[PDB]
Amino acid sequence: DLTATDLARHRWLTDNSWTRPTWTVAELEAAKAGRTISVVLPALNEEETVGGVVETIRPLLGGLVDELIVLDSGSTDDTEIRAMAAGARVISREVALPEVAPQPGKGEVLWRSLAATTGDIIVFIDSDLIDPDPMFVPKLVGPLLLSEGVHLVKGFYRRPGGRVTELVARPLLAALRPELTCVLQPLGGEYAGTRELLMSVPFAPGYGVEIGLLVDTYDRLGLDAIAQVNLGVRAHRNRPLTDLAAMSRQVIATLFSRCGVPDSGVGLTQFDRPPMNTLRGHHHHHH
Amino acid sequence: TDLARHRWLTDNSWTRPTWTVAELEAAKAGRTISVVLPALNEEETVGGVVETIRPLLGGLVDELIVLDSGSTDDTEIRAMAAGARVISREVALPEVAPQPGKGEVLWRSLAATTGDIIVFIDSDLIDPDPMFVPKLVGPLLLSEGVHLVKGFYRRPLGGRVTELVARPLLAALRPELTCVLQPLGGEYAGTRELLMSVPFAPGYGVEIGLLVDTYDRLGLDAIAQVNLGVRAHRNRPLTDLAAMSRQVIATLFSRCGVPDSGVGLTSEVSLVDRPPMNTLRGKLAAALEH
């Protein structure tokens, strides 16, 4: 028979998941009701793709999107200048948050972007995407603008790969936070959140940032606050095993830190930042 | 940190074991060796595996058994024709109702064998080699203090579950054990002293459960590893790999006391071990304490 996890998943998909997120740009603009939207592309040495991503979002600038920022992590290729020519605002880690010395990794960049942006909604899109589609941002913000109670929207892709998601993230969530196995692509880099949520949670480092935000949101607000939207068909990216293993190790560390499991700190053997509201700027368990 | 891993590799890992069958027979010193092949519907490969071990029977190997888990194909008749004794789960441990999975089969085989050393070899191997059993027992017979030998394969110049799940989780929760190249491997040998005294994890958790329990109870130097030869990675469907991963997680969490929900993947997940076989077969166990 069905489990409690199964029952919650079914209703969560009915209410909080969209296979055909077909909202129009015009109706989303009309729903902003004074809220502003910032889009952030984290980038480190992505010169071949960053401009193409920027180009797909730029038409929304001045309408649905209020600012389009590439948060550069110290590139030595032409990432920054290509982002400039394509129509983005390039901001370094140091300019984003001068009072804290940087540390490496993607999570650092996204955390710092909270200090560099002003939008009431912040959208994150990876800068390494080969086939970005112009409707990514509209689809990601739809549930935030139209659906009461949603604070985090995860963009997923249909497939015409995924090993860390299916062997590491989903099985560990099944063990530790089984309701969250409803989220198809928990490690995805395309997602949007409210400023109120994002300023209030710690940010995990590196490859842990996405799953850390998902779990921290769940632990504070449950499934009701999380939604997902289909961004379209995309083939899996083929990363080398050493990168996948490093990803996995950090996904493990970040899940363990949120779920009461200690961790040796020992990285792979080969052969967090505090809430930004501590620096800038209810879901009761009792009755 | 790696000094410990370095010393263990130097003393407890063999990439090119030199041992001959004759040298190992001469080192048995009265110990007997049982070989157990778990099998469920492996008719295409089981005979080929048995055939590589059968020449040792009556010399290095004292018993050669296929522990059948309820096959409906020709696994049993083909295993027998190749020279193995085929034992069902029911015959192995008749008064205990069977439960599914590989851990059950290996556990039950302890009640159906007499060896001081038990060697497990998978029955789905496409390219078995006759020196597998010799290489697995070498450290047990010729070194001192070893109780568990893990057979690994050199890879052409472990799989996804090993490198993304097992090794990273061991790094987090039993960090010394990342020295073991292929912790999930199905070819391994153990002493009766060890195997009769530990619980057995269910299903796909059995290998990692045994590794962790051996490490905790007997220590790193009680574990060894040997290269069985070069073998390509087997290609399995992602759904099978994910189910394996989920059970590896459950078993490691059990061994650490991490609450696991028991919720599978939209897959079977058991958190319940079988107890040490010496609790159900105390007289057999005592007879083999030697």
Coordinates of C-alpha atoms in Angstrom, one line a residue:
Chain A
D1 CA 0.0 0.0 0.0
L2 CA 0.9 3.7 -0.2
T3 CA 3.2 5.2 2.5
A4 CA 2.8 8.6 4.1
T5 CA 5.6 9.7 1.8
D6 CA 3.7 8.5 -1.3
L7 CA 0.5 10.3 -0.2
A8 CA 2.3 13.6 0.4
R9 CA 4.2 13.3 -2.9
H10 CA 1.0 12.8 -4.9
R11 CA -0.7 15.8 -3.5
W12 CA 2.4 17.9 -3.6
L13 CA 2.8 17.1 -7.3
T14 CA -0.9 18.1 -7.9
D15 CA -0.5 21.4 -6.1
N16 CA 3.2 22.4 -6.4
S17 CA 4.6 20.9 -9.6
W18 CA 4.0 22.1 -13.2
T19 CA 4.9 20.0 -16.2
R20 CA 3.6 22.7 -18.5
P21 CA 4.5 26.1 -16.7
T22 CA 2.9 28.1 -19.6
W23 CA 2.4 31.5 -17.8
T24 CA 2.9 34.5 -20.0
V25 CA 5.6 37.1 -19.4
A26 CA 2.9 39.8 -19.5
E27 CA 0.8 38.1 -16.8
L28 CA 3.8 37.6 -14.6
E29 CA 4.8 41.2 -14.9
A30 CA 1.3 42.2 -13.9
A31 CA 1.5 40.0 -10.8
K32 CA 4.7 41.6 -9.5
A33 CA 2.7 44.1 -7.4
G34 CA 5.7 46.2 -6.6
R35 CA 8.1 43.3 -6.1
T36 CA 11.3 43.3 -8.1
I37 CA 13.2 40.4 -9.6
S38 CA 17.0 39.9 -9.7
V39 CA 18.6 37.2 -11.8
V40 CA 22.1 36.0 -10.8
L41 CA 24.4 33.8 -12.9
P42 CA 27.3 32.4 -10.8
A43 CA 30.4 32.2 -13.0
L44 CA 34.0 30.8 -13.0
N45 CA 35.8 30.4 -16.3
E46 CA 32.7 29.9 -18.4
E47 CA 33.7 32.1 -21.4
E48 CA 32.2 29.7 -24.0
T49 CA 28.6 29.8 -22.5
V50 CA 28.1 32.8 -20.2
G51 CA 27.1 35.2 -23.0
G52 CA 24.6 32.8 -24.5
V53 CA 22.9 32.5 -21.1
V54 CA 22.8 36.3 -20.6
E55 CA 21.4 36.7 -24.1
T56 CA 18.4 34.6 -23.3
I57 CA 17.5 36.6 -20.2
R58 CA 18.3 40.1 -21.5
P59 CA 15.0 40.6 -23.3
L60 CA 13.2 40.5 -19.9
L61 CA 15.4 43.2 -18.5
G62 CA 13.3 46.3 -17.9
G63 CA 10.1 44.3 -17.7
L64 CA 9.8 41.1 -15.8
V65 CA 13.5 41.2 -14.7
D66 CA 14.8 44.2 -12.8
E67 CA 18.5 43.3 -12.7
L68 CA 20.7 40.7 -14.5
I69 CA 24.0 40.1 -12.7
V70 CA 26.9 37.8 -13.4
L71 CA 28.6 37.1 -10.1
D72 CA 32.1 36.3 -11.1
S73 CA 34.3 34.1 -8.9
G74 CA 37.8 35.2 -10.2
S75 CA 37.8 34.1 -13.8
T76 CA 41.0 34.2 -15.8
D77 CA 39.4 33.6 -19.2
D78 CA 37.0 36.1 -21.0
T79 CA 33.9 35.3 -18.9
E80 CA 33.6 38.9 -17.5
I81 CA 34.0 40.8 -20.7
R82 CA 31.7 38.5 -22.6
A83 CA 29.1 38.9 -19.9
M84 CA 29.4 42.7 -20.2
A85 CA 29.0 42.7 -24.0
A86 CA 26.0 40.4 -23.8
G87 CA 24.2 42.9 -21.5
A88 CA 24.8 41.8 -17.9
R89 CA 26.2 43.6 -14.8
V90 CA 29.4 41.9 -13.7
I91 CA 30.1 42.0 -10.0
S92 CA 33.0 40.3 -8.3
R93 CA 32.9 38.5 -5.0
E94 CA 34.9 41.3 -3.4
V95 CA 32.6 44.1 -4.6
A96 CA 29.5 42.1 -3.6
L97 CA 30.5 41.7 0.0
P98 CA 33.7 43.7 0.8
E99 CA 33.7 43.0 4.6
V100 CA 34.2 39.2 4.3
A101 CA 37.2 37.6 2.6
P102 CA 36.1 35.1 -0.1
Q103 CA 36.5 31.4 0.0
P104 CA 36.2 29.1 -3.0
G105 CA 33.1 27.5 -4.4
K106 CA 29.7 28.2 -5.9
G107 CA 27.8 28.4 -2.6
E108 CA 30.0 31.4 -1.7
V109 CA 29.1 33.2 -4.9
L110 CA 25.3 32.7 -4.5
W111 CA 25.5 33.8 -0.8
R112 CA 27.4 36.9 -1.7
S113 CA 24.9 37.7 -4.5
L114 CA 22.3 38.3 -1.8
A115 CA 24.3 41.4 -0.7
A116 CA 24.8 42.6 -4.3
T117 CA 21.1 42.3 -5.4
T118 CA 18.0 44.2 -4.4
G119 CA 15.2 42.0 -5.8
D120 CA 12.4 40.7 -3.6
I121 CA 12.8 37.5 -5.7
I122 CA 16.2 36.1 -6.7
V123 CA 16.6 33.7 -9.6
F124 CA 19.8 31.6 -10.0
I125 CA 20.7 30.2 -13.4
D126 CA 24.0 28.3 -14.1
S127 CA 26.4 30.0 -16.5
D128 CA 27.6 26.7 -18.1
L129 CA 24.3 25.9 -19.8
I130 CA 24.8 25.1 -23.5
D131 CA 21.1 25.3 -24.5
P132 CA 19.5 28.0 -22.3
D133 CA 15.8 28.8 -23.2
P134 CA 14.4 32.3 -22.8
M135 CA 11.4 31.1 -20.7
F136 CA 13.5 29.8 -17.8
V137 CA 13.1 32.9 -15.7
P138 CA 9.3 33.2 -16.2
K139 CA 8.8 29.6 -15.4
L140 CA 10.9 29.8 -12.2
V141 CA 9.1 32.9 -10.9
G142 CA 5.6 31.8 -11.7
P143 CA 4.8 30.0 -8.5
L144 CA 6.4 32.8 -6.4
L145 CA 4.3 35.4 -8.1
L146 CA 1.0 33.4 -8.4
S147 CA 1.0 30.7 -5.7
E148 CA 0.5 31.5 -2.1
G149 CA 3.0 30.2 0.4
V150 CA 5.7 29.2 -2.1
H151 CA 9.3 30.5 -1.3
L152 CA 11.5 28.2 -3.4
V153 CA 11.0 27.0 -7.0
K154 CA 13.2 24.2 -8.4
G155 CA 13.5 24.0 -12.2
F156 CA 13.8 20.5 -13.6
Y157 CA 14.4 19.1 -17.1
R158 CA 12.8 16.3 -19.0
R159 CA 15.3 14.0 -20.7
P160 CA 15.2 12.9 -24.3
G161 CA 23.9 11.4 -16.5
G162 CA 22.2 12.2 -13.2
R163 CA 24.3 9.8 -11.2
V164 CA 24.9 12.0 -8.2
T165 CA 21.2 12.8 -8.1
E166 CA 19.9 9.2 -8.4
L167 CA 22.6 7.4 -6.5
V168 CA 23.5 9.9 -3.7
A169 CA 21.0 12.8 -3.3
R170 CA 17.7 11.0 -3.7
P171 CA 18.6 7.9 -1.7
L172 CA 20.0 10.0 1.2
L173 CA 16.9 12.1 1.2
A174 CA 14.8 8.9 1.2
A175 CA 16.6 7.9 4.4
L176 CA 16.8 11.3 6.1
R177 CA 14.0 13.6 4.7
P178 CA 11.8 11.3 2.7
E179 CA 9.1 13.9 1.8
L180 CA 11.8 15.7 -0.3
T181 CA 12.2 12.7 -2.6
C182 CA 9.2 14.4 -4.4
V183 CA 11.7 16.9 -5.9
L184 CA 12.8 15.5 -9.2
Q185 CA 16.2 17.3 -9.5
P186 CA 17.3 18.5 -6.0
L187 CA 20.8 19.4 -7.2
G188 CA 19.6 21.6 -10.1
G189 CA 21.3 25.0 -10.5
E190 CA 18.1 26.7 -11.9
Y191 CA 15.9 27.9 -9.0
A192 CA 14.3 30.9 -7.5
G193 CA 13.6 32.1 -4.0
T194 CA 12.2 34.9 -2.0
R195 CA 14.6 37.4 -0.4
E196 CA 12.8 36.7 2.9
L197 CA 13.7 33.0 2.7
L198 CA 17.2 33.3 1.2
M199 CA 18.4 36.0 3.7
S200 CA 17.4 33.8 6.6
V201 CA 19.2 30.5 5.9
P202 CA 22.9 29.6 6.0
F203 CA 24.6 28.8 2.7
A204 CA 26.5 25.6 2.3
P205 CA 29.8 25.7 0.4
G206 CA 30.7 24.6 -3.1
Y207 CA 28.6 21.7 -4.5
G208 CA 26.5 21.6 -1.4
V209 CA 24.6 24.9 -1.9
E210 CA 21.6 23.6 -3.8
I211 CA 20.7 20.7 -1.6
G212 CA 21.5 22.7 1.6
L213 CA 19.0 25.4 0.5
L214 CA 16.4 22.7 -0.3
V215 CA 16.7 21.0 3.1
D216 CA 16.9 24.2 5.1
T217 CA 13.8 25.4 3.4
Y218 CA 12.0 22.1 4.1
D219 CA 13.1 22.1 7.8
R220 CA 11.7 25.6 8.2
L221 CA 8.5 25.5 6.1
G222 CA 7.9 22.0 4.8
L223 CA 6.8 20.9 1.4
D224 CA 4.1 23.6 1.1
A225 CA 6.8 26.2 0.5
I226 CA 8.7 24.3 -2.3
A227 CA 7.6 24.0 -5.9
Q228 CA 9.1 22.7 -9.1
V229 CA 8.6 23.6 -12.8
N230 CA 9.6 21.8 -16.0
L231 CA 12.1 24.0 -17.9
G232 CA 12.1 21.7 -21.0
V233 CA 14.1 18.9 -22.4
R234 CA 17.9 18.8 -21.8
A235 CA 20.4 16.0 -22.1
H236 CA 22.4 15.1 -19.1
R237 CA 25.9 16.7 -18.9
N238 CA 28.7 14.2 -18.9
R239 CA 31.1 15.2 -16.1
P240 CA 34.3 13.2 -15.2
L241 CA 34.0 10.8 -12.3
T242 CA 36.4 12.6 -10.1
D243 CA 34.2 15.7 -10.3
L244 CA 31.1 13.6 -9.6
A245 CA 32.8 12.0 -6.6
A246 CA 33.8 15.5 -5.2
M247 CA 30.2 16.6 -5.8
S248 CA 28.9 13.6 -3.9
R249 CA 31.3 14.0 -1.0
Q250 CA 30.1 17.6 -0.5
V251 CA 26.4 16.7 -1.0
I252 CA 27.0 14.1 1.8
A253 CA 28.7 16.6 4.1
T254 CA 25.9 19.2 3.6
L255 CA 23.1 16.7 4.2
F256 CA 24.8 15.4 7.2
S257 CA 25.3 18.8 8.7
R258 CA 21.6 19.5 8.4
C259 CA 20.4 16.1 9.5
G260 CA 22.3 15.4 12.7
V261 CA 25.1 13.2 11.3
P262 CA 28.7 14.1 12.2
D263 CA 31.3 14.0 9.5
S264 CA 35.0 13.3 9.7
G265 CA 35.9 16.2 7.4
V266 CA 38.0 13.8 5.5
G267 CA 37.7 14.5 1.7
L268 CA 37.9 11.9 -1.0
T269 CA 41.0 9.6 -0.9
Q270 CA 42.4 9.3 -4.4
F271 CA 44.9 6.8 -5.6
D272 CA 28.8 27.2 6.0
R273 CA 28.2 30.9 5.7
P274 CA 25.7 32.3 8.2
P275 CA 22.4 33.8 7.1
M276 CA 23.0 37.1 5.2
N277 CA 20.6 38.8 7.5
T278 CA 23.4 38.7 10.1
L279 CA 25.3 41.2 7.8
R280 CA 22.8 43.1 5.7
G281 CA 19.1 44.1 5.8
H282 CA 6.7 31.7 11.0
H283 CA 6.1 27.9 11.0
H284 CA 5.7 26.9 14.6
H285 CA 6.6 23.6 16.2
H286 CA 4.6 24.6 19.3
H287 CA 1.1 25.8 19.9
Chain B
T1 CA 46.0 10.1 7.9
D2 CA 47.4 8.6 4.7
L3 CA 50.4 7.3 6.7
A4 CA 47.9 4.8 8.1
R5 CA 46.5 4.1 4.7
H6 CA 50.1 3.8 3.4
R7 CA 51.2 1.3 6.0
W8 CA 48.1 -0.8 5.4
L9 CA 48.6 -0.9 1.7
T10 CA 52.2 -1.9 2.2
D11 CA 51.4 -4.9 4.4
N12 CA 47.8 -5.8 3.7
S13 CA 47.3 -5.2 0.0
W14 CA 48.6 -7.4 -2.8
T15 CA 48.5 -6.2 -6.4
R16 CA 50.5 -9.2 -7.7
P17 CA 50.1 -12.1 -5.2
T18 CA 52.8 -14.7 -5.8
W19 CA 51.1 -17.6 -4.1
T20 CA 50.9 -21.1 -5.7
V21 CA 48.1 -23.6 -4.9
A22 CA 50.8 -26.0 -3.5
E23 CA 52.2 -23.4 -1.2
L24 CA 48.7 -22.5 0.1
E25 CA 47.8 -26.2 0.6
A26 CA 51.0 -26.7 2.6
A27 CA 50.0 -23.8 4.9
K28 CA 46.5 -25.0 5.8
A29 CA 47.8 -26.5 9.0
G30 CA 44.6 -28.4 9.6
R31 CA 42.2 -25.6 8.6
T32 CA 39.5 -26.4 6.1
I33 CA 38.1 -24.2 3.4
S34 CA 34.5 -23.9 2.2
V35 CA 33.6 -22.1 -1.0
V36 CA 30.1 -20.7 -1.3
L37 CA 28.5 -19.2 -4.4
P38 CA 25.2 -17.4 -3.9
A39 CA 22.9 -17.9 -6.8
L40 CA 19.4 -16.8 -8.0
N41 CA 18.6 -17.5 -11.7
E42 CA 22.2 -17.5 -12.9
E43 CA 22.0 -20.5 -15.3
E44 CA 24.2 -18.9 -18.0
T45 CA 27.2 -18.3 -15.7
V46 CA 27.1 -20.5 -12.6
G47 CA 28.6 -23.6 -14.3
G48 CA 31.5 -21.6 -15.6
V49 CA 32.3 -20.3 -12.2
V50 CA 32.0 -23.7 -10.5
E51 CA 34.3 -25.2 -13.2
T52 CA 37.1 -22.8 -12.3
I53 CA 37.0 -23.9 -8.6
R54 CA 36.2 -27.6 -8.9
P55 CA 39.9 -28.7 -9.6
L56 CA 40.7 -27.5 -6.1
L57 CA 38.1 -29.7 -4.4
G58 CA 39.8 -32.4 -2.3
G59 CA 43.0 -30.3 -2.2
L60 CA 43.0 -26.6 -1.3
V61 CA 39.2 -26.5 -1.2
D62 CA 37.3 -28.9 1.1
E63 CA 33.7 -28.0 0.2
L64 CA 32.2 -26.3 -2.9
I65 CA 28.6 -25.2 -2.5
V66 CA 26.1 -23.2 -4.5
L67 CA 23.5 -21.7 -2.1
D68 CA 20.5 -21.4 -4.3
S69 CA 17.9 -18.7 -3.5
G70 CA 14.9 -20.2 -5.3
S71 CA 15.9 -20.3 -8.9
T72 CA 13.4 -21.3 -11.5
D73 CA 15.9 -21.6 -14.4
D74 CA 18.5 -24.4 -14.7
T75 CA 20.9 -22.9 -12.1
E76 CA 20.8 -26.0 -9.9
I77 CA 21.3 -28.7 -12.5
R78 CA 24.1 -26.8 -14.2
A79 CA 25.8 -26.1 -10.9
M80 CA 25.6 -29.8 -10.0
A81 CA 26.9 -30.9 -13.4
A82 CA 30.0 -28.6 -12.9
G83 CA 30.8 -30.3 -9.6
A84 CA 29.1 -28.2 -6.8
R85 CA 26.8 -29.3 -4.1
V86 CA 23.6 -27.3 -4.4
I87 CA 21.9 -26.3 -1.1
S88 CA 18.6 -24.4 -0.9
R89 CA 18.0 -21.8 1.7
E90 CA 15.5 -24.2 3.4
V91 CA 18.0 -27.0 3.7
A92 CA 20.7 -24.6 5.0
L93 CA 18.6 -23.4 7.9
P94 CA 15.3 -25.2 7.9
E95 CA 13.5 -23.9 11.0
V96 CA 13.9 -20.2 10.0
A97 CA 11.6 -18.8 7.3
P98 CA 13.6 -17.4 4.4
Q99 CA 13.7 -13.7 3.6
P100 CA 14.8 -12.2 0.2
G101 CA 18.2 -10.9 -0.7
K102 CA 21.8 -11.8 -1.0
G103 CA 22.8 -11.2 2.7
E104 CA 20.3 -13.9 3.7
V105 CA 22.0 -16.5 1.5
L106 CA 25.5 -15.8 2.7
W107 CA 24.3 -15.9 6.3
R108 CA 22.4 -19.2 5.9
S109 CA 25.5 -20.8 4.2
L110 CA 27.3 -20.5 7.6
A111 CA 24.9 -23.2 8.9
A112 CA 25.6 -25.5 5.9
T113 CA 29.4 -25.4 5.8
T114 CA 32.2 -26.7 8.0
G115 CA 35.2 -24.6 6.9
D116 CA 37.5 -22.7 9.2
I117 CA 37.6 -20.3 6.2
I118 CA 34.6 -19.4 4.0
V119 CA 35.1 -17.9 0.6
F120 CA 32.3 -16.2 -1.2
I121 CA 32.3 -15.9 -5.0
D122 CA 29.5 -14.4 -7.1
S123 CA 27.8 -16.8 -9.5
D124 CA 27.1 -14.1 -12.2
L125 CA 30.8 -13.6 -13.1
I126 CA 31.3 -13.8 -16.9
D127 CA 35.1 -14.3 -16.8
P128 CA 36.0 -16.3 -13.7
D129 CA 39.6 -17.3 -13.2
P130 CA 40.9 -20.4 -11.3
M131 CA 43.2 -18.4 -9.1
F132 CA 40.4 -16.5 -7.4
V133 CA 40.1 -18.8 -4.4
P134 CA 43.9 -19.2 -3.9
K135 CA 44.4 -15.4 -4.0
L136 CA 41.5 -14.8 -1.5
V137 CA 42.8 -17.3 1.1
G138 CA 46.5 -16.3 0.8
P139 CA 46.4 -13.6 3.5
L140 CA 44.4 -15.8 5.8
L141 CA 46.7 -18.8 5.5
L142 CA 50.1 -17.0 5.2
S143 CA 49.8 -13.8 7.2
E144 CA 48.9 -13.4 10.8
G145 CA 45.9 -11.6 12.2
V146 CA 43.9 -11.3 9.0
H147 CA 40.2 -12.3 9.2
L148 CA 38.6 -10.8 6.0
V149 CA 40.2 -10.6 2.5
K150 CA 38.5 -8.5 -0.1
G151 CA 39.2 -9.4 -3.8
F152 CA 39.4 -6.4 -6.1
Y153 CA 39.9 -6.1 -9.8
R154 CA 42.4 -3.9 -11.5
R155 CA 40.6 -1.7 -14.1
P156 CA 41.8 -1.2 -17.7
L157 CA 43.6 2.1 -18.3
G158 CA 35.0 0.5 -8.4
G159 CA 31.8 1.4 -10.2
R160 CA 29.5 4.3 -9.7
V161 CA 28.0 3.0 -6.5
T162 CA 31.5 2.4 -5.1
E163 CA 33.0 5.7 -6.1
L164 CA 29.9 8.0 -5.5
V165 CA 28.2 6.2 -2.6
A166 CA 30.3 3.7 -0.6
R167 CA 33.7 5.4 -0.6
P168 CA 32.4 9.0 0.1
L169 CA 30.2 7.7 2.9
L170 CA 33.1 5.7 4.4
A171 CA 35.2 8.9 4.2
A172 CA 32.5 10.6 6.3
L173 CA 31.8 7.9 8.8
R174 CA 34.7 5.3 8.9
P175 CA 37.5 7.3 7.4
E176 CA 40.3 4.7 7.5
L177 CA 38.2 2.3 5.4
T178 CA 38.5 4.4 2.3
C179 CA 41.8 2.4 1.8
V180 CA 39.7 -0.6 0.7
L181 CA 39.5 -0.3 -3.1
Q182 CA 36.3 -2.2 -3.8
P183 CA 34.3 -2.4 -0.5
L184 CA 31.2 -3.7 -2.2
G185 CA 32.9 -6.6 -4.0
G186 CA 31.3 -10.0 -4.0
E187 CA 34.6 -12.0 -3.9
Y188 CA 35.9 -12.2 -0.4
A189 CA 37.0 -14.7 2.3
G190 CA 36.6 -14.7 6.0
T191 CA 37.4 -16.8 9.0
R192 CA 34.7 -18.8 10.7
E193 CA 35.6 -17.0 14.0
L194 CA 34.6 -13.7 12.4
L195 CA 31.7 -14.7 10.3
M196 CA 29.9 -16.8 12.9
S197 CA 30.0 -14.0 15.4
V198 CA 28.7 -10.9 13.4
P199 CA 25.1 -10.0 12.4
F200 CA 24.5 -10.1 8.6
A201 CA 22.9 -7.2 6.9
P202 CA 20.1 -7.9 4.4
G203 CA 20.2 -7.7 0.6
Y204 CA 22.8 -5.5 -1.0
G205 CA 24.0 -4.3 2.4
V206 CA 25.8 -7.5 3.3
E207 CA 29.3 -6.7 2.0
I208 CA 29.6 -3.2 3.5
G209 CA 28.1 -4.4 6.8
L210 CA 30.7 -7.2 7.1
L211 CA 33.5 -4.8 6.2
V212 CA 32.4 -2.2 8.8
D213 CA 31.8 -4.8 11.6
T214 CA 35.2 -6.4 10.9
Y215 CA 36.9 -3.0 11.1
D216 CA 35.1 -2.0 14.3
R217 CA 35.5 -5.3 16.2
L218 CA 38.9 -6.7 14.9
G219 CA 40.6 -3.6 13.4
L220 CA 42.1 -2.4 10.1
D221 CA 44.9 -4.9 10.2
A222 CA 42.4 -7.8 10.3
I223 CA 41.3 -6.7 6.7
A224 CA 43.3 -7.4 3.6
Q225 CA 42.8 -7.0 -0.1
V226 CA 44.1 -8.9 -3.2
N227 CA 44.0 -8.2 -6.9
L228 CA 42.1 -11.0 -8.7
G229 CA 43.0 -9.6 -12.2
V230 CA 41.8 -7.1 -14.7
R231 CA 38.1 -7.0 -15.2
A232 CA 35.9 -4.4 -17.0
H233 CA 33.2 -2.6 -15.0
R234 CA 29.9 -4.5 -15.3
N235 CA 27.1 -2.3 -16.7
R236 CA 23.9 -2.4 -14.7
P237 CA 20.7 -0.4 -15.1
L238 CA 20.6 2.8 -13.1
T239 CA 17.5 1.6 -11.3
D240 CA 19.4 -1.4 -9.9
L241 CA 22.3 0.8 -9.0
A242 CA 20.0 3.2 -7.2
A243 CA 18.4 0.3 -5.2
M244 CA 21.8 -1.0 -4.3
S245 CA 22.9 2.5 -3.2
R246 CA 19.8 2.9 -1.0
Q247 CA 20.5 -0.4 0.8
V248 CA 24.2 0.4 1.2
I249 CA 23.1 3.6 2.9
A250 CA 20.6 1.8 5.1
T251 CA 23.2 -0.7 6.3
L252 CA 25.9 1.9 7.0
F253 CA 23.3 4.0 8.8
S254 CA 22.4 1.0 10.9
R255 CA 26.0 0.5 11.8
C256 CA 26.3 4.1 12.8
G257 CA 23.0 4.5 14.6
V258 CA 21.6 7.0 12.1
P259 CA 17.8 6.9 12.0
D260 CA 16.9 5.7 8.6
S261 CA 13.3 6.1 7.6
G262 CA 13.2 2.8 5.8
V263 CA 11.6 4.6 2.8
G264 CA 12.7 3.1 -0.5
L265 CA 13.0 4.7 -3.9
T266 CA 9.9 5.0 -6.1
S267 CA 12.6 -0.3 -3.8
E268 CA 13.1 -2.7 -1.0
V269 CA 14.9 -1.4 2.1
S270 CA 15.5 -3.4 5.2
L271 CA 17.0 -2.1 8.4
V272 CA 16.9 -5.5 10.2
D273 CA 20.0 -7.7 10.4
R274 CA 20.1 -11.5 10.9
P275 CA 21.7 -12.3 14.3
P276 CA 25.1 -13.9 14.5
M277 CA 24.8 -17.5 13.4
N278 CA 26.4 -18.7 16.6
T279 CA 23.2 -17.7 18.4
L280 CA 21.1 -20.2 16.4
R281 CA 23.9 -22.8 15.8
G282 CA 25.8 -22.6 19.1
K283 CA 27.0 -26.3 19.1
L284 CA 28.2 -26.1 15.5
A285 CA 29.9 -22.8 16.3
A286 CA 31.6 -24.2 19.4
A287 CA 32.8 -27.3 17.5
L288 CA 34.6 -24.9 15.1
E289 CA 36.2 -22.6 17.7
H290 CA 39.2 -24.9 17.8

